[PDB]
Each structure stands twice: as structure tokens, then as C-alpha cells.
DNA sequence: TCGGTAAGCAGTCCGCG
DNA sequence: GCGGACTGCTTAC
């Protein structure tokens, strides 16, 4: 098999590499790597090395990496460019693996673990590690086993062994319900003292050394705790055995009260699953506890236990250990669904970087572009300092706030990467400039054609048409990958709806789910077989289809993020190819494209509808247009349609057969105007929106920029079994809006869009009467708590103190003297509740860590003094008033002359 | 050697016989 | 008690 790396580190003048060899065995080597860098030399000498602009360079081969570094500094002091890859481990990887990496994941040791630490005096701080580690569960992906290290004797209590038999039982039968599919995979190891547990864990670690180390919050808790605990007991040298190269780096975090640490373990790639989740999931959660995310991702119940966690080991050691095991499994379950570890491996090996560098789009692209150019014997430019400069971005149309009955949307495929490829924007393809006219002059095609020789953007930049650029070349590769995966995702989504449609008439049979690949649209034969399946098999197929859809979502959306990341990278000062001329060539072209096509669509639709000067395009943002389809529907007349699906088909056909070719014609003309390399402005129909036929639903509404709702029947070729709400920007979409309020506002919207004013008024009235009966967490607001210290003045709010920080300070004073009340963590999220005047907390609001119940001592008072009136007004009524006034609708029946009767 | 912009809304401060 | 000029947070893209 072809060899591939696992980890790589630079340690002084040595590269330390863990790798898989040709026989599939894990090995480690130390290499005294001799790096090369480059300097410009005169033309009149035979070299094979050229910079990206075609200028000749001479190679400088160094005896060691220090020498190469020191030479860089001398060149800066002389004032001459030092070219080549300055991150030597990237050069080493590029030299060692000069081919496309084909890795075997079954050879990569992926470890996830979590520890328990009983603490009788508040949160057990990793920097101090003053309490015994009393449990560790460590799952190893090669053994496919959960290794459980359990402390029986502790200064905080002596306990009996954990029982696997009791663990497997239903919670309703006094067990812990450890999932049956992992019972046989547990290897249980009890210990009579902490020293023996830790030594054995260390010996175990040596035998089974993680390559990928993950888990929930491992970077900020488990790793530094294990490290500092071992250090305090045995010494730092022993603690360094957690590094296969015996090298660590300790970073102390600042704040003011309660410093933290991050430990870098050399030769290990730490991918904290919380960080993977935040980067790759595209959610913003009100809480990031494992309980909350697990419920969200897997629909599994919260792991219940009685009393404080500080007393869980002594009162119920059995459950304590079981919950430790289940928590490790939950992360594995989330990963089986989300596939972020797979993505990280995919992306890291593609780029030829340390696996943990997938967090950095800049490092990722630097390495991709470096490897690409090196293949051509080209030499990369030195990184340079730039002052941070703001620059212009996308165009967003101001919508007229209103209801909009029939809406069709259209969207440009992968816009910024497509602009890069169309225009041929790259550091080395810059051909020159032209004198810019006002943007509106290009949009209206009155400005002089920029060039008849070069490919242009309306920012004034010209690029070569007949030359490949490394940025377009490499961005096209990842785009093509993205396209493949999004195809699988959309197919799986279409397949899902087939199953949902078949679930309306399930068969009374004992059968099995069909063995199919959900990444491809079902054949007619499969659809016929599905129409004859039982509910049980249909439901199993739907789960499978949806899992396939999620897998494809992960793969496509993050490849999209990577390629869009390259366009933004050009505007980040730390990027080797930072260049506002290029960043701005992209965004300005985007602005022109949206507004050009707005004009062309208004022109086309007026023509075909036989009118003049009417505005069909009601809104647009960056690369999308929203077209009012009322007059298209009216020209045929509403009465002609048999049902909702009839007019949806009509609009779908109209869009594909008439609008799209006209849109294509328009963008082809734009491409000729800018004399671009390749026409890649592909704008396809996205949503078809409207009320159900014969209903009083309003179909849709906008309140302003980035704030709208639509009743959608078809999305990107997925005809929904049931209409789906597309809500952007409104409070229903915001993580700061209370849970029960998002639900209530969404139902208010569903009613407005599908049913009408009366239905809305009926629901509002019910919700208002029941508001005060909702659970307090479900109606609490949420906010991130940044810069808490700044506004803290002897425990009281300083000037300009934000509402949520004021709430934290109120909580801080309320839990003063308390031992085991959870502290608010800087940068994390809090629930927030308003408090009535006169309350014993002494201030207008309280805030506490999100995803948690508020501590039992003050919970009673919070419930008593909660200001329901303010809460209802601020979180529910005020946004609803925004939606309804925009929609020319009332959520409460207005007084009228009719009030004299009854009725 | 750590490494995108546009834009809406809640809230504080302050002006306001 | 409600605006305008800020900060802060959050979402659309
Ligand atoms: N997180 C994001 C989202 C968008 N944008 C920019 C780049 C996109 O090209 C453009 C349009 O956003 P879209 O959400 O429509 O995404 P794309 O057009 O790139 O992809 P597609 O429409 O094919 O899904 O806005 C960005 O820089 N970063
Ligand atoms: Ca725990
Ligand atoms: Ca798009
Ligand atoms: Ca059937
Ligand atoms: Ca879009």
C-alpha cells in the first residue's frame, strides 16, 4: 500500500513524523530535514526555478532549519525577498508525499475520551488539578473498545465496583441503559488508588497512542486536567509521556479571576469535537453542553441523575461510571451521523497539512497552492505585512416591506468561486488596469467596454484570458468535488420525499427495507416497490435516506465554505496572496452581476407579460433575486388551476423553459461585455412560493433587508410532500430568541402564510393566555457573555454595561458564598430573564449558564420575580408586530363600528 | 510565527419646559 | 417615553 503520514512536528532542527508504512504498520522517524528557500537571481544564468511572475530564482539549500530561518531574517534586514515555503513541515510533507495521498482510515488511531473529577469546592480547574481523577473512559477506534478506568478509593469516598449487568438494564428497572451495542465492547478496569490508575493509563497510552485525539471539550478540560494532574503527582517529565515525542507546550490564558491552560501535545492531532461541531455543523446553538447537542442531533433524552454532580460518585457510583461511558459514546454517535472526523481527514490529506490545520482555511489554501506551484517548479512569494483595510462586499436590495403572494427565487451557483474562474482572478494572472466608470454605468451597459484583449472586473482589474491561474485551477478542483457531493445530498433529499409520499398509504406486510443507494434518484422499479412496503420498512428507509442526506450535506457545505474561504482569504492580511485588487475584483463583479440580471429579468418579464416599467424583482442579496410571480399567475388567471401542485408545476415550467434561457442570454452578454475567459454565471430557479390554492394565506412577506418568510412548495427541484417554511433572519432563526418563542412565532408565521389573518388572531390569543404557564428555561433569552470583566465594578454594572452582563453580575452577587453553584464562563452562553421592580436580587435581570437549570437555592426566587409581562412584550409581541405591520395584517382584532353588535 | 462584508435589532446614554 | 448615536450580538450571504 502507498505510505501516508499521521502526524508531523518541527522540533528544533528535527522533523518528527508518525506515519503508516508500505506494509500498513505504524512507525515513527526523526529526520534532520534540509529545507530550501529561494532568492531572485539575474536572468543570464541557467536555473529551473521561477517565481509566480516568471522571474528567475536561485535555490538555497540549508544544512538545517535554524540556518534557513536565520537567513530569512538577514534578507529582511537587507531588504530583499526570501521566497519559498517558510513553514518547513509543509515542505517536508510535500517532499515526502509527492503524489495524491490515499489514506486508510482503519490504520489511523482515533481516540476519544473523557474524564470525571469529583470536586467538593466548585469547578475543578485544570490549571490547578488539585482533585483526583476518579474515572476515565477512552474509546480506541482500532480496537473498537471502550477502556474504562475506575477509581474505587478516593479521599472523597470509597465505592464498590461498577456493574455491567446493572448498567445494561432499563432506567425504568433501576439500570443505566448503557446501549446494548456497546456492552460487549467495554473493557472495565477498577483501581484501588489514583497513582495506579494514572500509571496504567500512561502505559496504556504508550501502547495505543492517539493520532487523532477527540471528545467533548477535551482541549479545555480533559487534556489539561490529565496533564496537570499527572504533573502534580509524578512530575512534569511523566506528564510529557502523553506526547510521543515527549514534548509539550503550555499556554496560560489571561482574563482576571481564574486563569486557564491549553496544552499542545507534540505528535498528536487534537480535534476537540466541540470545535469541529462549531466549524462544520452550521448551527448556532443556545448551549454547547453534550446533553443539549445530543438531544438536538440524535433525539436522545437528557442523562438524568439526582443531586449535584459533586455528590454523584458517592451517592451513585454505578450511574456515575455509566454516564461517563455513555458520554463518550454520544460523541461517536454524533460523528457517525455528521462525519466531521472523516471530513477533517479528507481535507487534511488533500491539502498535505497537519490534520488540526483544517480549522484554518488560510493554512489549508497556502498548502494547497504551495503544492500546486511546486509541481510546476514555481517558487512561492514571501509572506508580507499589511495594514488591515476595510473593503466593499456584496449588494443587497432594499425591499418594499409588504406581503408577497407568489414568489419565485433564482440563485447563482457557487458565485464567488465562479467569478474567480470566469474572470481568471489569481495573483499571477493580473494583466493590468482600466479606467473605471461608475458601477451603475456597467449595470446599465452604457459604460465603454473595459477591454477587447483582457478579461475584466468592474473594479478596474484586467486578467489574462490565455493563461491558467493557480487560484482558479485549485478552486475548480474543490468546486467539482463540492458539486458531486451536493448532487448526492439533493438526490437523497428527493428520495426522502418519495418515502414520505408513500407513508400516506403504507402496506400491511412483514417485509424489509430495500437495499438501495440513496445518493441516486430512485429508479421507476424502486418507486413501484416502495408503494407496496409496510410502514416499518418505509420509516427505516426514511431514516437511511435522511442520514445519507446529512452525510452529503457535511461533505458539500464544508467544501463550499473552503472555496468561499479562498475568496475571503484574498482579503485577509495573513494570507500569502492577500491582494485587495483581487478580493475587490470578486465582490464588485458580484454586485454588477446581481444588478445586471435584475435589469434583464425586469426587461424580459415586462416583454412577455406585455407591459412596461413594472418591477418584478422585489428583492435580492449578493447572488439571488426574488421575483413576484403574481402577474404571471394572473395572466393565465387563478381559476384555471386544479390544485396547488398545478400552479407549482406551471411556475416550475415557466422558470425552466422561459426565464432561465433569458437569464442565460443576459449573463452571456455580460461575459462578452467584460470579455471574460469563461461564462460561468449559472443562475437557476431556487424556490417556488405561494399560499395553498383557495386558502386565505398571504404566501410570503419581507420586513426589510435579510428578513423574510416564504411558504415553499419546491426547492432546487425537491417537490415537498408538505409545504415548508423558508424563514430567513426573523427571530425564529436566532439562537438568542427563547425556545418556546421561536416555536410560537413560527406557528404565527405558518398561519399568516398558509391560512390567513383570522387563523393568526386565534393562535395569538391562545399563546398570550398560556404564556405564563411555560417552563422558565423555554422562555428565557440567550446571549453570549463577552468582556464580563470590563463592566464589573465591585460586583456591580459599570457604564454602558450590556443587559446580559448586568444579569451575570446579578447572578454573581446572588451566588457569593455558595460553594457548588456553577460559575459563568467568559465567552460562553447564558440564559437571561427580566426581573420585576423590588426583587431581592436588587436589579432588573438575572443570567446563568445556558443549557442548565438555575441553582436550587435561587431558583425559587427567580420563578417568583420573573417578569412575564416584559418577557412577552420584548421577545414575542414586538417581533410579531414587526412581521404583521410589514404584512399589512393584525395579530389582534382592531376596534370597528361593528363592535356595537353581537356577533 | 498564532490569523470575507452587509446589515438588522436590543440595549445604554442622553436630550428633552 | 421615544428618538439618534453609539456598542454588542447575531444572521444572510
Ligand atoms: N458563508 C458564506 C456564504 C456566502 N458568502 C459569499 C460567497 C458566495 O459565493 C456568495 C453567495 O452565497 P451562497 O449562500 O448563495 O453560496 P454559493 O453561491 O457560494 O453556493 P451555492 O448557491 O451553489 O450553494 O456569498 C461567503 O463569503 N461566505
Ligand atoms: Ca461528566
Ligand atoms: Ca448561490
Ligand atoms: Ca403502499
Ligand atoms: Ca444565495
Topology of this protein?
Blueprint: E1 4-11, E2 14-20, E3 26-31, E4 36-40, E5 49-51, E6 56-61, H1 65-78, H2 88-96, E7 110-116, E8 135-140, E9 145-151, E10 153-154, E11 157-158, H3 164-168, H4 180-183, E12 186-191, H5 194-207, E13 212-214, H6 222-234, H7 236-239, E14 248-252, E15 261-265, E16 269-270, H8 273-280, H9 290-298, H10 312-338, H11 340-351, H12 361-375, E17 378-379, E18 402-403, E19 407-412, H13 415-423, E20 430-433, H14 439-443, E21 455-456, E22 461-463, H15 470-502, H16 524-530, H17 535-569, H18 580-609, E23 617-621, E24 624-628, H19 630-636, H20 644-673, E25 683-689, E26 700-704, E27 707-715, E28 718-728, H21 739-754, H22 757-770, H23 776-779, E29 781-784, E30 792-793, E31 796-797, H24 803-814, E32 829-834, E33 845-849, H25 856-865, H26 868-886
Parallel strand pairs: 5-17, 7-13, 9-12, 13-16
Antiparallel strand pairs: 1-2, 2-3, 4-6, 5-6, 7-8, 8-9, 10-11, 14-15, 18-26, 19-24, 19-25, 20-22, 21-22, 23-24, 25-27, 26-27, 27-28, 29-32, 30-31, 32-33
Helix pairs in contact: 9-10, 11-12, 13-18, 15-17, 18-20, 21-22, 21-26
The structure holds 2'-deoxycytidine-5'-triphosphate (DCP) and calcium ion (4 copies).
The structure holds a DNA duplex (17 and 13 nucleotides).
Amino acid at each position: 500500500m502507498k505510505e501516508f503520514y499521521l502526524t508531523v512536528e518541527q522540533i528544533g532542527d528535527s522533523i518528527f513524523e508518525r506515519y503508516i508504512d508500505s506494509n500498513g504498520r505504524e512507525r515513527t522517524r526523526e529526520v534532520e530535514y534540509k529545507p530550501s528557500l529561494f532568492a531572485h537571481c539575474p536572468e543570464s544564468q541557467a536555473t529551473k526555478y521561477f517565481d509566480i511572475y516568471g522571474k528567475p530564482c536561485t535555490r538555497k539549500l540549508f544544512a538545517n532549519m535554524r540556518d534557513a530561518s536565520q537567513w530569512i531574517k538577514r534578507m529582511e534586514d537587507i531588504g530583499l525577498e526570501a521566497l519559498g515555503m517558510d513553514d518547513f513541515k509543509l515542505a517536508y510533507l510535500s517532499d515526502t508525499y509527492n503524489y495524491e495521498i490515499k489514506y486508510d482510515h482503519t490504520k489511523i488511531r482515533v481516540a476519544n475520551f473523557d474524564i470525571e473529577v469529583t470536586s467538593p469546592d466548585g469547578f475543578p480547574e485544570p490549571s490547578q488539578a488539585k482533585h483526583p481523577i476518579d474515572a476515565i473512559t477512552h474509546y480506541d477506534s482500532i480496537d473498537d473498545r471502550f477502556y474504562v478506568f475506575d477509581l474505587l478509593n478516593s479521599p472523597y469516598g470509597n465505592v464498590e465496583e461498577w456493574s455491567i449487568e446493572i448498567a445494561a438494564k432499563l432506567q425504568e428497572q433501576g439500570g443505566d441503559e448503557v446501549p446494548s451495542e456497546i456492552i460487549d465492547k467495554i473493557i472495565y478496569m477498577p483501581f484501588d488508588n489514583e497513582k495506579e490508575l494514572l500509571m496504567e493509563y500512561l502505559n496504556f497510552w504508550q501502547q495505543k497512542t492517539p493520532v487523532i485525539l477527540t471528545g467533548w471539550n477535551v482541549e479545555s478540560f480533559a487534556i489539561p486536567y490529565v496533564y496537570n494532574r499527572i504533573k502534580n503527582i509524578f512530575g512534569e517529565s511523566t506528564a510529557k509521556r502523553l506526547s510521543p515525542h515527549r514534548k509539550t507546550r503550555v499556554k496560560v490564558i489571561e482574563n482576571m479571576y481564574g486563569s486557564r491552560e491549553i496544552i499542545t501535545l507534540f505528535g498528536i492531532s487534537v480535534l476537540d469535537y466541540i470545535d469541529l461541531y462549531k466549524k462544520f455543523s452550521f448551527t448556532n446553538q443556545p448551549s454547547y453542553s453534550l446533553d443539549y447537542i445530543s438531544e438536538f442531533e440524535l433525539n436522545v433524552g437528557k442523562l438524568k441523575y439526582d443531586g449535584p454532580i459533586s455528590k454523584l460518585r458517592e451517592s451513585n457510583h454505578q450511574r456515575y461510571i455509566s454516564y461517563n461511558i455513555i458520554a463518550v459514546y454520544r460523541v461517536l454517535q454524533i460523528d457517525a451521523k455528521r462525519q466531521f472526523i472523516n471530513l477533517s481527514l479528507d481535507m487534511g490529506y488533500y491539502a498535505k497539512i497537519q490534520i488540526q490545520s483544517v480549522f484554518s482555511p488560510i493554512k489549508t489554501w497556502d498548502a494547497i497552492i504551495f503544492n500546486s506551484l511546486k509541481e510546476q517548479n514555481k517558487v512561492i512569494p514571501q509572506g508580507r505585512s499589511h495594514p488591515v483595510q476595510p473593503y466593499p462586499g456584496a449588494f443587497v436590495k432594499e425591499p418594499i416591506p409588504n406581503r408577497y403572494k407568489y414568489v419565485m427565487s433564482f440563485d447563482l451557483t457557487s458565485l464567488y468561486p465562479s467569478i474567480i474562474r470566469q474572470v481568471n482572478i489569481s495573483p499571477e494572472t493580473i494583466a493590468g488596469t482600466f479606467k473605471v466608470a461608475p458601477l451603475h454605468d456597467y449595470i446599465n451597459a452604457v459604460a465603454e467596454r473595459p477591454s477587447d484583449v483582457y478579461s475584466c472586473s468592474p473594479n478596474g482589474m484586467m486578467y489574462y484570458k490565455d493563461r491558467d491561474g493557480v487560484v482558479p485551477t485549485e478552486i475548480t478542483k474543490v468546486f467539482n468535488q463540492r458539486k458531486e457531493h451536493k448532487g448526492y445530498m439533493l438526490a437523497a433529499q428527493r428520495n426522502g420525499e418519495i418515502i414520505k409520499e408513500a407513508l400516506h398509504n403504507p402496506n400491511l406486510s412483514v417485509d424489509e427495507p430495500l437495499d438501495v443507494d440513496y445518493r441516486f434518484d430512485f429508479s421507476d422499479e424502486i418507486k413501484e416497490k416502495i408503494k407496496k412496503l409496510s410502514a416499518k420498512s418505509l420509516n427505516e428507509m426514511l431514516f437511511r435516506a435522511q442520514r445519507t442526506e446529512v452525510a452529503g450535506m457535511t461533505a458539500q457545505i464544508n467544501r463550499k465554505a473552503l472555496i468561499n474561504g479562498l475568496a475571503g482569504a484574498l482579503g485577509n492580511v495573513w494570507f500569502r496572496y492577500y491582494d485587495l485588487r483581487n478580493a475587490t475584483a470578486i465582490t464588485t463583479f458580484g454586485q454588477m452581476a446581481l444588478q445586471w440580471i435584475e435589469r434583464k429579468v425586469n426587461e424580459y418579464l415586462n416583454e412577455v407579460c406585455g407591459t412596461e416599467g413594472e418591477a418584478f424583482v422585489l428583492y435580492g442579496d449578493t447572488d439571488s433575486i426574488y421575483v413576484s410571480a403574481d402577474k404571471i399567475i394572473d395572466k393565465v388567471g387563478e381559476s384555471k388551476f386544479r390544485d396547488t401542485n398545478h400552479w407549482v408545476d406551471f411556475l416550475d415550467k415557466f422558470a425552466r423553459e422561459r426565464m432561465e434561457p433569458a437569464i442565460d442570454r443576459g449573463f452571456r452578454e455580460m461575459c462578452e461585455y467584460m470579455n471574460n475567459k469563461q461564462h460561468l454565471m449559472f443562475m437557476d430557479r431556487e424556490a417556488i412560493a405561494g399560499p395553498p390554492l383557495g386558502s386565505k394565506g398571504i404566501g410570503g412577506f419581507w420586513t426589510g433587508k435579510k428578513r423574510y418568510a416564504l411558504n415553499v412548495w419546491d426547492m432546487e427541484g425537491t417537490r415537498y410532500a408538505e409545504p415548508k417554511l423558508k424563514i430567513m433572519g426573523l427571530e425564529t432563526q436566532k439562537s438568542s430568541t427563547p425556545k418556546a418563542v421561536q416555536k410560537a412565532l413560527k406557528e404565527c408565521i405558518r398561519r399568516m402564510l398558509q391560512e390567513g389573518e383570522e387563523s393568526l388572531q386565534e393562535y395569538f390569543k391562545e399563546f398570550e393566555k398560556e404564556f405564563r404557564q411555560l417552563n422558565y428555561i423555554s422562555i428565557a433569552s440567550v446571549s453570549s457573555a463577552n468582556n464580563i470583566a470590563k463592566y464589573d465594578v465591585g460586583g456591580f454594572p459599570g457604564p454602558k454595561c450590556p443587559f446580559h452582563i448586568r444579569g451575570i453580575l446579578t447572578y454573581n452577587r446572588a451566588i457569593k458564598g455558595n460553594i457548588d453553584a456553577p460559575q459563568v464562563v467568559e465567552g460562553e452562553k447564558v440564559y437571561v430573564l427580566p426581573l420585576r421592580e423590588g426583587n431581592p436580587f436588587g436589579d432588573k435581570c438575572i443570567a446563568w449558564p445556558s443549557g442548565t437549570e438555575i441553582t436550587d437555592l435561587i431558583k425559587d426566587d427567580v420563578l417568583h420575580w420573573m417578569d412575564y409581562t416584559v418577557l412577552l412584550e420584548k421577545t414575542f409581541i414586538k417581533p410579531l408586530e414587526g412581521f404583521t405591520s410589514a404584512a399589512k395584517l393584525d395579530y389582534e382584532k382592531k376596534a370597528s363600528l361593528f363592535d356595537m353588535f353581537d356577533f
